[PDB]
Design a protein around this nucleic acid. Structure first.
Ligand SMILES: [Zn+2]
Length: 648
RNA sequence: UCCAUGCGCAUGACG
RNA sequence: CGUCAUGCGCAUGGA
């Protein structure tokens, strides 16, 4: 470990009290400095012989594993106890004990919160902040009054004001805080920005920001920002489909009040889908669903090879066929829509073969294929775009590979942490990555960062500029010109603004600063209390059975309220095979489907039972016709299951 | 190592 | 407040 000069002074006040913030660019290696603040705090406590604890926090697991790999252990391997925690790395020994041991802690946020709640919520193990003498944080810009991290700072604040009302005194920890450029939220002025910054600091109860101004020279030596650059590159098939859409409006008497190829049409479609669900009618929500599909097909067609819309609707309508045949094992509505499609499908694929939207960016990348293209990065919005384009390039054009996140959403096969690590290792050796907004991932040396239809804020901008370092960092920014370049411009604008604001706040009276931060702290606390009041008022009924669940295409009875049961206190289910007389089953490569053709759920095979579980998205309520997308919205409760019932 | 599920959060666009 | 897309964390159950 070592204490680079620009790191020295910025750390300096923290060494004695001084709950602060630090914000520095990429490359400065702000972990090493943090290690010094630790070690010096620890050594101070040993000089005092008192409880020296650190309870480091992050947002992501990967950084925790990283710092347990690289930074904290290899400099504190000798003296002190460390442990690299995470919600997923199974730890046999529970959290309060690794507080009772393990002087140093890497961790991850909501671990802590959960332990605190078990302290306050139930008679469980529990833990409090009083067991500490320091907290350290990373990426403070994710701090707000809403999220985690942190809610718990509002506990720090509440307890602090308890201490102050006592003084106007049990101890409380120092609070460091680190970050990149803190950015700024939802401004057009300096004053709104400054107010944001003050909200940040007083969410941390800190004292200053304390950036670097003196030793900018060695910094700029280590930090060589690449060139801020812009680059841009920018039919009857579309029309062929728009005609059908209008034909279907005629078939349905649906008035868009807007155009095709935007979110507005989609949103109106969803609203009509609710109303037609609030009517239990047909050609009225069913066609909202279809038209959602069509509009998605459009707005990919405006950006994506129309072969991929053919793929999308191949998937869709082929699944429609399979649904209707597993149900057979069709009416005017389905027959009209399906045949309206199939009469054209083949010729539409023929059109799909034919080459603005279709000739795109071949030169935009082959320029660098010819210049160097060793390294490659691509951003975009979506998942499906990535798979699609990687397929398209593997067919037409450089060996490539995709990348996306992890979550269970979008009706896609997601990826896995492991396989992400695989990919980034291969890239530390693949030439070009295709990614969504994922890239706190360790990458560098690159040159050809680009942007295929992006929006994102200043921080994603500068952090993407952190990766492709000072070697021909040709930042492209693609978009069909018909204000996306405006977004890079405003990112520059905010980059100016945060500096202009930091300067205006570093240079401030301590008294006035204290008054402002005190008022923001009290505001945040009072708002949390209002939140808790409204929230406690939220759930009130808790009724066993007041309802009937119905199919939403056919307004048909599907379940009552008391016949339902629960498992895991998560999933709902209906035994009582009177119900079982209804449904149909499907699987390919299981799923419950309808007598009409609606999708209903999954045959959850657990606990030695084929419990038929369902999803309330797909059903509709009758206590007003209401839809929720999740069970928890109503308060009215259902029982937990009794296996003695299933006595044979 | 993989699969299934619930919950909460932020971001950006949109009304 | 509602919609969409993206990303993150936690908690369950199974192989
Ligand atoms: Zn039905």
């Amino acid at each position: 470990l070592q204490l680079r000069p620009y790191q020295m002074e910025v750390a300096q006040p923290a060494l004695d009290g001084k709950n602060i913030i630090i914000c520095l660019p990429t490359g400065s290696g702000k972990t090493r400095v943090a290690v010094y603040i630790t070690k010096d705090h620890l050594d101070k406590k040993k000089q005092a012989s008192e409880s020296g604890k650190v309870i480091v926090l992050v947002n992501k697991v990967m950084l925790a594993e990283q710092l347990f790999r690289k930074e904290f252990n290899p400099y504190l391997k000798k003296w002190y106890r460390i442990i690299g925690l995470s919600g997923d790395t199974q730890l046999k020994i529970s959290f309060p004990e690794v507080v009772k041991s393990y002087d140093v802690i890497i961790s991850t946020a909501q671990i802590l919160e959960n332990s605190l709640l078990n302290l306050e919520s139930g008679d469980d193990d529990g833990v409090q902040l009083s067991d500490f003498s320091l907290i350290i944080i990373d990426e403070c810009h994710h701090t707000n009054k809403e999220a985690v991290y942190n809610n718990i700072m509002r506990r720090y604040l509440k307890q602090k004001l308890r201490n102050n009302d006592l003084k106007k005194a049990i101890p409380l920890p120092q609070i460091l805080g680190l970050t990149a450029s803190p950015g700024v939220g939802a401004a057009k002025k300096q004053s709104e920005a400054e107010k944001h910054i003050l909200n940040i600091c007083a969410n941390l109860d800190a004292f200053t920001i304390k950036t670097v101004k003196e030793n900018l020279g060695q910094l700029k030596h280590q930090i060589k920002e690449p060139c801020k650059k812009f680059v841009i590159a920018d039919n009857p098939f579309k029309e062929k489909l728009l005609e059908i859409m209008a034909s279907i409006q005629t078939y349905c008497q649906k008035s868009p009040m807007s155009d095709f190829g935007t979110q507005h049409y989609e949103q109106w479609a969803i609203q009509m889908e609710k109303k037609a669900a609030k009517d239990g009618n047909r050609k009225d929500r069913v066609c909202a669903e279809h038209l959602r599909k069509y509009n998605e097909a459009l707005q990919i067609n405006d950006t994506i090879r129309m072969i991929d819309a053919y793929s999308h609707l191949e998937t869709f309508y082929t699944d429609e066929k399979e649904k209707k045949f597993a149900v057979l094992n069709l009416d005017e509505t389905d027959e009209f829509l399906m045949n309206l499609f199939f009469d054209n499908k083949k010729m539409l694929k023929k059109l799909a073969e034919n080459p603005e939207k279709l000739i795109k960016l071949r030169n935009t990348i082959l320029e660098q294929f010819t210049r160097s293209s060793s390294r490659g990065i691509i951003f975009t919005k979506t998942r499906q775009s990535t798979y699609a384009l990687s397929q398209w390039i593997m067919e037409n054009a450089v060996k490539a590979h995709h990348l996306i996140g992890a979550g269970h959403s979008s009706e896609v096969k997601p990826m896995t942490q492991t396989e992400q690590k695989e990919v980034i290792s291969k890239f530390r050796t693949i030439n070009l990555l295709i990614a969504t907004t994922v890239a706190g991932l360790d990458i560098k040396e690159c040159n050809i960062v680009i942007r295929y239809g992006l929006v994102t804020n200043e921080i994603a901008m500068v952090q993407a500029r952190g990766r492709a370092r000072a070697d021909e960092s040709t930042y492209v920014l693609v978009t069909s010109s018909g204000g996306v370049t405006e977004r890079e411009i405003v990112n520059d604008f905010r980059e100016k603004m945060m500096y202009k604001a930091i300067n205006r706040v570093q240079n401030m009276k301590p008294e006035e600063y204290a008054h402002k931060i005190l008022e923001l702290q009290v505001q945040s606390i009072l708002e949390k209390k209002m939140k808790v009041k409204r929230s406690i008022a939220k759930q009130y009924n808790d009724n066993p059975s007041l309802i009937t669940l119905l199919c939403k295409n056919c307004s048909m009875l599907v379940c009552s309220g008391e016949n339902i049961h629960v498992i895991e206190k998560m999933h709902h289910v209906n035994m009582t095979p009177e119900f079982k007389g209804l449904y149909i089953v499907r699987e390919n490569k299981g799923e419950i489907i309808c007598k009409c053709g609606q999708a209903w759920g999954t045959m959850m095979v657990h606990k030695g039972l084929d419990l038929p579980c369902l999803k309330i998205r797909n059903f509709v309520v009758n206590f007003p016709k209401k839809q929720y997308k999740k069970w928890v919205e109503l308060p009215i409760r259902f029982p937990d299951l009794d296996y003695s019932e299933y006595c044979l």
